[PDB]
């Protein structure tokens, strides 16, 4: 069989890629940022506590207006909150109680949900009968749905446990594009600000960069030793951050095609569930399984503070567009705002 | 108050939504959740005569509602969706007594589920389905087919006792769980009653543990 020749060619290509990456590693980010003065200790206090959910909270998503919020819990309810007044605007019953993700449309007219049912449900918020009703039920995945993000009112990207990602149109409800190439369950995805590229992380300890137009992988970032549970994107649009089960986070650049920085400490021995950046991009907030959220300096690897006050696992984490506040959700059936 | 009229109306709407959430939660609280597991030939789909996502079944016997979830359809890695079932009353494991390879990977699944890092305080109702059919089969052929190391006579008693002792001996977390083993007859009419008894017992134990009286 000539499969051995193909394997040898693939190994040679891997060696070439490794050599090319190593050649570009002239120095380290720490050497450049040595002269940077520290951010300073951050003191954040819980401003608003949102009550009403009666089960573990699995996901949340901020609104574009920076005032509305959407949350999902296993009780079987989708809740829209007004953060300022702590008022419930909408409560939505779900057919399947097992939900693990939610999304908010950029225009604020639609919401999305999905989970172990292998369907992505799209609900319409603006209607003439004054009620929220199902607009679509996108089907076509073989495994559980992990994440979903809107591009506009017409298109949506999902990732699922069939080791696949998908781009869907909505007025036809058909699988427009399919992204394959992973070997393990895809757990997260994050849209670039120019909504033309995105990244995904899977249980094969890898992350991949996809172009929405073409539909094929361009770059593959590796270096983790376990599953990647969360992924974010740098505000500029040229780098991203990851979180894995071996209690570390890493920063990967697009142009250099290699990691620049790793955020680990001896006391932290638990995995990361969520990750996000601030408006400027020098603050990296990451939830953990020790009932805590840690804020790292994105350039110098110095824990600038903690966000304690949750009695269970921190599942979902989100930073507002204007950068005013951070929102966390926990398995203890509570959402909190830390400004 | 310093609010306007529309603000007061929004607050009233929020209060109504809160009331509805309270009633729905109190209604959902009056239910018992069970994790139905076993081989495809075990007979889990026919466990209770009272009767692609998660398979769901619901039945009420003697003023108690039970929702059984079958999650064998989910072929992804169990590590990343098994924590969604940590808050369930019990795991109902059905074993096919007759088929031998079937019962073998049934032991594999039993050990895997019992030794999880999440199900460290939950109990198993083990239904030994196909009792008399396998009894006749074991009259025909010994248990050496799979339990080759096992030494015993051709009688059904010794083979069944060995199989039950095995399935209870793969357990390691004997400190905070208790297996309820039931020989399942073809026309068994005590299945729902047995589930009722087990659920009541485990809920009493749960009260005892939270109150610290156990």
């Amino acid at each position: 069989s000539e499969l051995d020749q193909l394997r040898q060619e693939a190994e040679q290509l891997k060696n070439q890629i490794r050599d090319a990456r190593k050649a570009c590693a002239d120095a380290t980010l720490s050497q450049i940022t040595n002269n940077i003065d520290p951010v300073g200790r951050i003191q954040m206090r819980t401003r608003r506590t949102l009550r009403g959910h009666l089960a573990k909270i699995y996901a949340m998503h901020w609104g574009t207006d920076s005032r509305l919020l959407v949350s999902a819990s296993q009780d079987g309810k989708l809740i829209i909150w007004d953060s300022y007044t702590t008022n419930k605007v909408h409560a939505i019953p779900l057919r399947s109680s097992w939900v693990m993700t939610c999304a908010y449309a950029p225009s604020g007219n639609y919401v999305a949900c999905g989970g172990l049912d292998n369907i992505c449900s799209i609900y319409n918020l603006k209607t003439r009968e004054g009620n929220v009703r199902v607009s679509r039920e996108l089907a076509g995945h073989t495994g559980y749905l992990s994440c979903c993000r809107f591009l506009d009112d017409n298109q949506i990207v999902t990732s699922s446990g069939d080791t696949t990602c998908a781009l869907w149109d909505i007025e036809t409800g058909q699988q427009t594009t399919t992204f394959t190439g992973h070997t393990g369950d895809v757990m997260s995805l994050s849209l670039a600000p120019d909504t033309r590229l995105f990244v995904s992380g899977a249980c094969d300890a890898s992350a991949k960069l996809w172009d929405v137009r073409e539909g094929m992988c361009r770059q593959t970032f590796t270096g983790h030793e376990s599953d990647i549970n969360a992924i974010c994107f740098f505000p500029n649009g040229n780098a991203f951050a990851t979180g894995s089960d071996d209690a570390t986070c890493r920063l990967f650049d697009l142009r250099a095609d290699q990691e620049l920085m790793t955020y680990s400490h001896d006391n932290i021995i638990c995995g990361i569930t969520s990750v996000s950046f601030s408006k400027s991009g020098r603050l990296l907030l990451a939830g953990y399984d020790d009932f805590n959220c840690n804020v790292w300096d994105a350039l110098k690897a110095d824990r600038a503070g903690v966000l304690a006050g949750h009695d269970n696992r921190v599942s979902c984490l989100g930073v507002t567009d204007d950068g005013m506040a951070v929102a966390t959700g926990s398995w203890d059936s509570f959402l909190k705002i830390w400004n | 108050c310093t609010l306007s009229a529309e603000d007061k109306a929004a607050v009233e709407r929020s209060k109504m939504i809160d009331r509805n959430l309270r009633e729905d939660g109190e209604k959902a609280a009056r239910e018992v959740k069970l994790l139905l597991l076993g081989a495809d030939n075990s007979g889990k789909s026919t466990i209770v005569k009272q009767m692609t996502g998660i398979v769901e079944t619901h039945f009420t016997f003697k003023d108690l509602h039970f929702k059984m979830f079958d999650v064998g359809g989910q072929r992804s890695e169990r590590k990343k969706w098994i924590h969604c079932f940590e808050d369930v009353a019990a795991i109902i494991f059905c074993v096919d007594l007759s088929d031998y390879n079937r019962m073998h990977e049934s032991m594999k699944l039993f050990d895997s589920i019992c030794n999880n890092k999440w199900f460290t305080d939950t109990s198993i109702i083990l239904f030994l389905n196909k009792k008399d059919l396998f009894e006749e089969k074991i009259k025909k052929s010994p248990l050496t087919i799979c339990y080759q190391e096992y030494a015993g006579s051709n009688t059904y008693e010794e083979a069944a006792a060995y199989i039950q002792c095995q399935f209870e001996d793969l357990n390691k977390r004997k400190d905070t769980k208790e297996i309820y083993t039931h020989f399942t007859c073809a026309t068994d009419t005590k299945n729902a009653q047995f589930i009722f008894d087990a659920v009541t017992d485990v809920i009493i134990k749960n009260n005892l543990k939270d109150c610290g009286l156990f």
Partner: single-chain antibody, 232 residues
Framework: DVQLVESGGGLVQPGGSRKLSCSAS????????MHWVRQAPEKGLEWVAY????????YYADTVKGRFTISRDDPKNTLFLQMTSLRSEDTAMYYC??????????????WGQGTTLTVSSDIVMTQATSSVPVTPGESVSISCRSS???????????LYWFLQRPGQSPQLLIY???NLASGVPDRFSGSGSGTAFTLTISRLEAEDVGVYYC?????????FGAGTKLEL
Amino acid sequence: DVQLVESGGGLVQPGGSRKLSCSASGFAFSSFGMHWVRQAPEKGLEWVAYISSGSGTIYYADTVKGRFTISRDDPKNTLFLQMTSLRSEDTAMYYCVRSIYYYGSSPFDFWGQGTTLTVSSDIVMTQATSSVPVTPGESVSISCRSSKSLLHSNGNTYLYWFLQRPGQSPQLLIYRMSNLASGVPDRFSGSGSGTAFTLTISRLEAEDVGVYYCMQHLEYPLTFGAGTKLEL
């Protein structure tokens, strides 16, 4: 389609009683508060009554307090106004109007059709102009005023704009002085300064021939303007 149909009016003698009814169809009646609003035979619109969703808060005007009772039957999609001790001042046409309240909702969006009854601390709105001769393609700017500033600490200016075409029920145009309602021509615009407000219409058409009203929603009772009429 949303339809509020009211019936129960007619001719009554002084001192009588009548129970007007209002049937809703095509929307969730349980989530909407309802207002009863009357218009004199030849005059402007006047507020009467309001009942909230869930029947938790009820408001009546001073004039019709003690004699009018507002009720609703959510399981039957019906609203009732029971009137006792009628007088000649009560002759009018009555409308049902729906309202819903959350962050970013449009109240007073859909009005009824009208039922006629012919018997045998308040903010004052100011719409001084009454008749405006107009030509298609021109621009018009209706203005109105207030007694107390309609701006609140939350940052919202509670002013609403309505247009009544000849032989038609009033239609919402603008809510909170700047937001255009759904299904309204884009040529309409609204502006305000907290005490004085203006509605501007570019590219005037035969459609925009009718009476324009401005209303305040800052506090109860809700008060209307006299009405400025644009006619070709």
